[PDB]
C-alpha cells in the first residue's frame, strides 16, 4: 500500500542520481571538445596563406610581336616570359612595373609602375586636419584657389 | 498517502530514462574530444617549422593596396607577398626590416 508504492520508489531513486552525475560530468568534456574544435580550424587556415607562394617582380623592358614580352626581372637577369590571358598586350606598354610568377615566370598580373624608391618616401600619408572653416581673414584667396 | 506516494514515483521513474540515455550519448563525446585535442597539437607543430631558420632579410620597398605587400630581398628579388593573421602588414611599414 504505502509499504509497497515506497519500496519501488526508493531504487528509482537512487539510480536516476547515478545517471545524473555522469551527464554532468561528461557534459564539460563536451564544452572542452568545443574549444579544441576552434582551435584545429584556425591554426591550419592561417599556416596555409604563408605557404602560398608569392610573385617576382619584373618590368616590361620589350615587348615582342611573337605574344612574348620581354621583361627584366628583380632577379636581376633579363628574361623572355609569355603573357597570360588574364593580363592583355593592349594592356601592357614597355615601361610597366608587371607581376610574373615565381614558378614558370610568366605574365599573371600587373603592378603598375615604378613604385619605388619609396612611394611613401614621397608623402602621401593622413588628410590635413585643416579646412577652410578653420581659416579666417584670407577670405580672398581661398575662393579663387577652391574653386 | 497512496496519492502522494505515486506522484515521487512517476517523477523519479521519468527522469531516470531521460538521463540513461543522455549518458550514454555523451559516453562517446568523451572520444571527439581526445580527436581534436591530437590534431590542434599537430598543427602547432606546424606553425613551429615556419618560425625556424633559414631565415632572410627583407625590407619594404612600397605596400600596395589589394593584399600584397612589396618586399625587397637582400638577394635581390622584389616580391609580392600574401600575409596570414599571425603577423600582419598592418604591423608592416614602408623601410621595414622583416
Redesign the interface.
Known sequence: ??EK??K??ED??K??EL??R??DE??F??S??IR??R??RR?????E??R?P????GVVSDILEDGRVVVK????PKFVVNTSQYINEEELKPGARV?LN?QTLAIV?V?PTS???????FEVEEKPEVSYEDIGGLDVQIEEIRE
Not at 591554426?43 to 599556416?47: G, I, P, T
Request: net charge positive; charged share 35%; glycine share 4%.
Open positions: 500500500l504505502l508504492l515506497k519501488l520508489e528509482y531513486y539510480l536516476r545517471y545524473r555522469l551527464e561528461k557534459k568534456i563536451e572542452e571538445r579544441y574544435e582551435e584545429v591554426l591550419r587556415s592561417e599556416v596563406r604563408l602560398s608569392p610573385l617576382l617582380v626581372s628583380s632577379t636581376g607581376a615565381q598580373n603592378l613604385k619605388d624608391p619609396m612611394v611613401y618616401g
